[PDB]
Design a protein around this ligand. Sequence first.
Ligand code: HEM
Ligand SMILES: *[C@@H]1O[C@H](CO)[C@@H](O)[C@H](O)[C@H]1NC(C)=O
Ligand SMILES: *[C@@H]1O[C@H](CO)[C@@H](O)[C@H](O)[C@H]1NC(C)=O
Ligand SMILES: *[C@@H]1O[C@H](CO)[C@@H](O)[C@H](O)[C@H]1NC(C)=O
Ligand SMILES: *[C@@H]1O[C@H](CO)[C@@H](O)[C@H](O)[C@H]1NC(C)=O
Ligand SMILES: *[C@@H]1O[C@H](CO)[C@@H](O)[C@H](O)[C@H]1NC(C)=O
Ligand SMILES: [Cl-]
Ligand SMILES: [Mg+2]
Length: 326
Amino acid sequence: PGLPPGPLENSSAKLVNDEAHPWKPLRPGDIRGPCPGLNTLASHGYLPRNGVATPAQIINAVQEGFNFDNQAAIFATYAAHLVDGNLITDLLSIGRKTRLTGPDPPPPASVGGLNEHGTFEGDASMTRGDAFFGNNHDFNETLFEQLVDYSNRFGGGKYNLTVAGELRFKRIQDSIATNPNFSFVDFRFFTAYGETTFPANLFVDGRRDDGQLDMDAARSFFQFSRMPDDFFRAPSPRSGTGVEVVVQAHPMQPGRNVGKINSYTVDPTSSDFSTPCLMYEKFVNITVKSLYPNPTVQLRKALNTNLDFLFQGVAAGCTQVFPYGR
Ligand code: HEM
Ligand SMILES: *[C@@H]1O[C@H](CO)[C@@H](O)[C@H](O)[C@H]1NC(C)=O
Ligand SMILES: *[C@@H]1O[C@H](CO)[C@@H](O)[C@H](O)[C@H]1NC(C)=O
Ligand SMILES: *[C@@H]1O[C@H](CO)[C@@H](O)[C@H](O)[C@H]1NC(C)=O
Ligand SMILES: *[C@@H]1O[C@H](CO)[C@@H](O)[C@H](O)[C@H]1NC(C)=O
Ligand SMILES: *[C@@H]1O[C@H](CO)[C@@H](O)[C@H](O)[C@H]1NC(C)=O
Ligand SMILES: [Cl-]
Ligand SMILES: [Mg+2]
């Protein structure tokens, strides 16, 4: 495994839809998944165009192409890789499970790519359906049209943090009403809020950086994995700034439906925004450990290396935990 890349040496706004990074359509076998950011980076050649990449490639791409901040890049990438990637070959699919990530580890590890439900990916996504409904990864036109409607109603036709606050809650309530297996705890509880800020913070042309995403650009990213012509990345490193506005709009507790619709039951063992270090500890002690309960020598070493890298992305003040010793 390569070392996690450091922050950008020059984080100014600049043209990122440039001659070296043209949009190209998918070829047979090219993989796209539930993340429009990574999808767009792959479709502009910031990542390998087939959608299989190393953690270091992913971190470099999100920084270079979108000015995603280093700490957020490290945490997200190594979390995803630990639960969805191949730790021996150092390869992660940004979408469906693929033989291209190499020989699989033993069960119960799945190495399912970002499409794997319940490891990283989860319910109440904005433009992707819940896994229960049959497809957690493809762009969904009806859900996107709802995003447009919420942008018209709360953002004057643009997507901004006010729109994010209302749409986040709408998607939660729709999943409660229709998905008897709806889960909204721990890792997903956190990412579900942060992700709604990303279109406002990262898909807005960096010469403006005003938090108001137009619907032409929104469709280009969300559906076609395509930067607008002449797209400048954000003018400084960021990820989830303004997430407090989204939470404040409709504060929620972590919980799940309990095998029936309209049965949302709060989980007091879940982390929430008052316990960010617990989210990290549970992710390692429960989620990662359950995939690799008794790893053989080379897997144990790879796990420990990637867990060290994950901890570099954890907010200061948390204590590192060691599921396979020091
Ligand atoms: C740094 C590594 C990244 C990883 C591993 C990653 C992975 C993911 C995954 C797995 C999801 C699906 C979440 C779910 O259903 O629970 C997601 C959602 C999302 N990601 Fe990323 N992501 C990364 C960076 C970024 C960046 C840099 C951007 C924007 C420039 C971005 C924009 C989004 C958006 C907008 C969604 C929400 C899609 C929707 O709900 O319709 N992500 N990401
Ligand atoms: C950083 O990049 C910007 C945009 O390409 C450029 O104008 C600026 O001069 C660069 N700064 C340094 C210190 O090289
Ligand atoms: C149902 O929820 C459980 C966890 O509560 C999860 O393991 C499973 O993958 C979920 N399946 C779908 C399709 O939502
Ligand atoms: C898209 O989402 C809608 C609304 O939840 C759902 O009814 C539909 O089956 C999804 N899939 C497609 C292919 O439209
Ligand atoms: C979203 O846009 C609407 C209409 O322009 C505006 O009232 C609201 O203040 C905006 N919110 C943010 C956070 O920019
Ligand atoms: C995680 O495991 C460590 C021991 O390796 C323990 O000290 C810590 O309390 C655990 N945290 C949780 C939330 O289970
Ligand atoms: Cl940074
Ligand atoms: Mg999802």
